[PDB]
Amino acid sequence: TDPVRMYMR
Amino acid sequence: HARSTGSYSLVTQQPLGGKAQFGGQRFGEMEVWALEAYGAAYTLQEMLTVKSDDVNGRTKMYKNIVDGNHQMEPGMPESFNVLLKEIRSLGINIELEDE
């Protein structure tokens, strides 16, 4: 989850 | 304090305490149990419809009373229509069905 973390990755 | 009819709530359409209109008492689960154990079906139905959230039922009840009459046809409590519509917005199909 956590779309912010995914996007940053 | 006491109330015959008075202000109602926006969403729920349940009787609401105004500034001059006293508002209404809560008939809760346990009171409902009390009426059920007495097998008092029409009193309970009155509590659940004409005396609370049904606009058609309360208007018809009031008019009938000032004209002298028997209990008006119930309508599903507005909060039940609210529940149905809210369940529809959840994407589950809810269908009232015939016999």
Partner: protein, 89 residues
């Protein structure tokens, strides 16, 4: 109060009596007080219940009165009601 136990004695299983009383009261309210004797006091509910006590109203008898009433509705109409239906074809 009103010797209610006797009234319930007239109609087994409490509940039914209530319905009967209620229905009777509605009749009283709807048209012509009429009915059985006539204490003439304490409104429709008491009058209906008291009437029930003297087995005056009765569950079956009310039905019989209604059935006869249906025949009364038949009366008038009849040939004139048959006129409205026979005219149309």
């Amino acid at each position: 109060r009103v010797t209610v136990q006797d009234a319930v004695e007239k109609i087994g299983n409490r509940f039914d009596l209530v319905l009967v009383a209620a229905r009777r009261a509605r009749q009283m309210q709807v048209g012509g007080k009429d009915p059985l004797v006539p204490e003439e006091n304490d409104k429709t509910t008491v009058i209906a219940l008291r009437e029930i006590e003297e087995g005056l109203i009765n569950n079956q008898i009310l039905d019989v009165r209604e059935r006869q009433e249906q025949q009364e509705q038949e009366a008038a109409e009849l040939q004139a009601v048959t006129a409205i239906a026979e005219g149309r074809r």
